[PDB]
Structure 1
């Protein structure tokens, strides 16, 4: 059957950043695997954080705390800022 992946979104982000630069297929696979790895790390950490406090749901607060736990320093600060902006824009729309 079909095998889903994040190829097109990474392609769009690359075209946004460097319009004239392409990307090889193996690099695309590496990027997709990296995205999946980060997603599973953050999801597992948020799940454990929610289970620690004996809650039933995963909200934005758990994701923010997990991001603060995983990403070190400036990456954490920028990621938190971007997440806050995205959440505010979505809730305003």
Structure 2
């Protein structure tokens, strides 16, 4: 049966930024772990945020707050400026 991983999107993104470069298989497992750790931290914090405010859904703002808590510094104001591109394009 199928096992499923993020392994292709990290490779796709590598060819976005370093078109000559590659990854060893052992160094893929790192990205395939890291990328789902940050998934869980955002899901867990966004879940608590909905609960504290006694909502049921989790709209964009329930995540933009979870990113603006969880990320340390310039990464917060960058990631917030990056995600507000994506939904602004999607809703056209």
- TM-score bracket, shorter-length normalisation: over 0.9
**1:73 to partner: Cα distance:** 1.3
RMSD of aligned Cα (Å): 0.5
List structure 1 runs of 4+ shifted beyond 3 angstroms.
none
SS of equivalent to 1:57: coil
2:58 counterpart of 1:58: yes
Instruction: Indicate the structure with greater strand content.
Output: 1
Structure 2, unpaired ranges of 5+: none
- Alpha-carbon deviations, 1:18-75, whole Å to 9, x = none? 0111101111111010011000000000000000000000110010000000001100
What TM-score, normalized to structure 1? 0.97
Structure 2 CA distance, aligned partners of 1:33 and 1:60? Answer: 25
